Design a binder for this molecule. Structure first.
Ligand SMILES: Cc1cc2nc3c(=O)[nH]c(=O)nc-3n(C[C@H](O)[C@H](O)[C@H](O)COP(=O)(O)OP(=O)(O)OC[C@H]3O[C@@H](n4cnc5c(N)ncnc54)[C@H](O)[C@@H]3O)c2cc1C
Ligand SMILES: Cc1cc2nc3c(=O)[nH]c(=O)nc-3n(C[C@H](O)[C@H](O)[C@H](O)COP(=O)(O)OP(=O)(O)OC[C@H]3O[C@@H](n4cnc5c(N)ncnc54)[C@H](O)[C@@H]3O)c2cc1C
Lengths: 101, 100
């Protein structure tokens, strides 16, 4: 049950939905939790290789949690790096808000 | 157009899979990360009411991450508590390593 793909789809839904709700002017804690959440995922994501790649991506592209727009975009760019590595379509990050409300 | 219900299903799939892959003998960091992960969720979970409900549950049921079995079990109970309040069927918590 639950393949690498099912996990990915579920998590992206959670992450992008989360970035869709992120506040315009986040508090110091909300900013901290978002960054901590990504760090935790870089170590804990339930798919070995996937977690290593996320770790790399996170190293070179730290989370932009300054606001809803920066986080939504950042998360979309991160998702695209994975898409590209897998030979999948690359999503236009100007439409993230249209895809995730 | 993700719904409150699609968010929930996605999240439980993530959590439960995470709890199914948790190590038998977690390190000090892994225990810490899993715990902080639940705390982050109770503040950050999208649906407002849902965040507050989960926050009260975590209050009286602090996360147990001493091992895969304990974490799986704790997560399973914390989920039945939610199903219950929603009028849903209860999942027997010996069957966690089943759905996940
Ligand atoms: C943190 C993380 C790291 C991952 N790393 C790997 C890896 O190293 N190797 C591996 O094999 N798998 C990895 N995966 C899995 C992978 O990214 C896929 O989820 C899986 O292959 C299924 O692809 P899918 O085509 O159904 O679309 P996903 O990539 O799962 O799609 C979610 C859906 O969201 C949308 N979407 C697509 N791109 C974006 C975007 N840029 N922004 C907003 N929405 C978008 C589309 O509607 C799409 O169908 C990872 C998943 C996560 C959550
Ligand atoms: C932390 C958290 C808090 C939530 N709080 C609320 C809330 O306050 N209000 C609200 O309207 N919604 C809330 N939700 C959403 C809700 O719990 C549902 O996810 C949603 O209603 C969809 O229900 P579903 O019937 O598809 O099953 P879910 O409850 O999403 O099911 C996941 C699936 O996992 C299984 N499963 C069921 N019970 C267990 C268990 N005890 N252990 C292991 N697996 C189980 C079954 O196979 C089931 O179909 C929350 C979600 C999360 C992740």
């Amino acid at each position: 049950p639950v393949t690498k793909e099912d996990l990915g789809r579920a998590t992206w839904t959670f992450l992008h939905t989360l970035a869709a709700q992120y506040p315009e002017k986040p508090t110091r804690q909300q900013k901290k939790d978002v960054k901590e959440l990504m760090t935790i995922l870089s170590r804990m994501y339930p798919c070995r290789e996937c977690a290593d790649h996320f770790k790399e991506i996170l190293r070179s592209n730290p989370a932009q949690a300054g606001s809803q727009e920066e986080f939504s975009q950042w998360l979309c760019h991160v998702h695209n790096t994975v898409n590209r590595s897998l030979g999948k379509l690359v999503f236009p990050c100007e439409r993230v808000d249209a895809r995730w409300g």
